[PDB]
Design a binder for this molecule. Structure first.
Ligand SMILES: NCCCC[C@@](N)(CC[C@](N)(CCCCN)C(=O)O)C(=O)O
Ligand SMILES: [Mg+2]
Ligand SMILES: [Mg+2]
Ligand SMILES: [Mg+2]
Ligand SMILES: [Mg+2]
Ligand SMILES: [Mg+2]
Lengths: 296, 296
């Protein structure tokens, strides 16, 4: 299978006066490239995929593709939807506009059955010829792609090569790689990046790497090179920031931290997301002081 | 406050060859009217709001408004979204096209904070002058509108008049009505319609009433008159069908039952929803044989 693995960043989407700040978006991607990241994910959950229009979503994918061209950094485009026809349209767009692969979150809200999830992802994978990474995040979607469904999709659909797991369930990570060791398990939960990698996971799609791309990329590369002592050392050092970035729903804390570090111009969200509480604003700012934050 | 209460139906959306069957849709609404229902909810969760286009969503609202003219039956239009700008657009459409009020599900997937939920619903409520019913269903959205937030919205926004609770939490139902007895608590969980109504709830937005509108209507009107013996008897009789209609994710079982009763011509869903398993198809049919199902 063709694969996209390694240290990857779920890019925040900066806004200016209610619109996507496209110059800021490209500048932040260049900063990821300069700090060892292997791939970027435009317009995942961290990118406020829910509140972008379909046109803005496509613009962000195009910016990522253009900014990474000529570098060895890949674009794994966010393309998920709770409607299969919408996810297929996003998948086809990402393929036609030069993305290296797509990330596709399990349908939120409408709670498909396992049979429905299988048919959903099969429709997506058959619509393109680029790699497709499944994405399980039951705390947000209300459904879980079971281990059996993931493995069947991996074995039945050429392009489906692994899953981004954001479920806090290391038992399921063992289950997945014990029964299908050929798939690419990707960590979608920063605090447990190292445990997922040490069990044979092959990358991360990180929120924290927006702020600390050098540290997340180093953790991942230490682990892939089997230097577990050094990978665990960074995972341990990052625990405090990894947890504080979820003190309110992602991406409210990471955007707050990016603003506090001077990496984006304005702390702007699209409703229903909004600024953190004053208390959480202070906690994020306090935790950040312990870390060296790279500039541009 | 202007209110929409009583026995209400979360309408299924029938499809024919992948398009909304608009003739079937009107016929199903007329059947609800003739069987004692007080209001209909086009394109809620049960109506596959996630997989309709915005244009199809608007078409269904219009069919409902047209079909209810000249009757006592109100149209509480589904207008929720995980993006505030989309929810405001739907609210404004429902207002301008003659809906009596709107239902507005808590944002799914992006997990707004309580502050964000407050700002989301305040924007929606200020965009129209018709009644707004909040809708809480954490199992589907990944978030929940806390009691404090519901009550603050009820007290702060003239047209927010209550909440449809689908959370299986009768303690919260006591909490809501003990601290703000003026609000309209609406059951969004058929199995516990009678317990919610007997604690002072003022209506239901029902899945089961798609199939058994006369029974849900009678249960609700018995309860509203404090004829609790009769209301409980119907709630008890309905328990088996109420539970089997959730043996797979709603609306897969209710659409299956409507098809099994000849009330819709095709057992068609939009992916990622799909037909139930053969075993659940047979289980649904077996439970249906115990109930008296009205025709057209
Ligand atoms: N990634 C950019 C598009 C975002 C669109 C949407 N806000 C809504 C998607 C939708 N399927 C629209 C249905 C419209 C008719 N009700 C949904 O709200 O579920 C989402 O997927 O979260
Ligand atoms: Mg590299
Ligand atoms: Mg996605
Ligand atoms: Mg009227
Ligand atoms: Mg709604
Ligand atoms: Mg009667």
């Amino acid at each position: 299978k063709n694969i996209i693995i390694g240290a990857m960043t779920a890019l925040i989407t900066p806004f200016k006066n209610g619109k996507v700040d496209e110059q800021s978006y490209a500048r932040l991607i260049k900063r990821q490239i300069e700090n060892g990241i292997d791939a970027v994910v435009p317009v995942g959950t961290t990118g406020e995929s829910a509140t972008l229009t379909h046109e803005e979503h496509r613009t962000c994918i195009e910016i990522a593709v253009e900014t990474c061209k000529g570098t060895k950094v890949k674009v794994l485009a966010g393309a998920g939807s709770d409607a299969t026809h919408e996810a297929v349209g996003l998948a086809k767009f990402a393929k036609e506009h030069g993305a290296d692969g797509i990330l596709s979150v399990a349908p939120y809200y409408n709670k498909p059955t396992q049979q429905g999830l299988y048919e959903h992802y099969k429709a997506i994978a058959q619509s393109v010829d680029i790699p497709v990474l499944l994405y399980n995040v039951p705390g947000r979607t209300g459904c879980e792609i079971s281990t059996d469904t993931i493995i069947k999709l991996f074995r039945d659909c050429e392009n489906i090569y692994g899953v981004k797991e954001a479920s806090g369930n290391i038992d399921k990570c063992v289950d997945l790689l014990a029964h299908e060791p050929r798939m690419m398990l990707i960590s979608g939960e920063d605090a447990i990046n190292y445990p997922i990698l040490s069990n044979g996971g092959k990358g991360v799609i990180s929120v924290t790497s927006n702020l600390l791309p050098d540290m997340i990329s180093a953790l991942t590369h230490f682990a892939l090179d089997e230097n577990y002592k050094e990978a665990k050392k960074i995972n341990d050092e990052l625990y405090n920031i990894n947890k504080i970035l979820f003190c309110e729903s992602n991406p409210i804390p990471i955007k707050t931290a990016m603003y506090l570090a001077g990496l984006i111009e304005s702390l702007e969200f699209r409703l229903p997301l909004c600024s953190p509480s004053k208390e959480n604003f202070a906690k994020i700012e306090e935790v950040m002081k312990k870390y060296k934050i790279k500039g541009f």
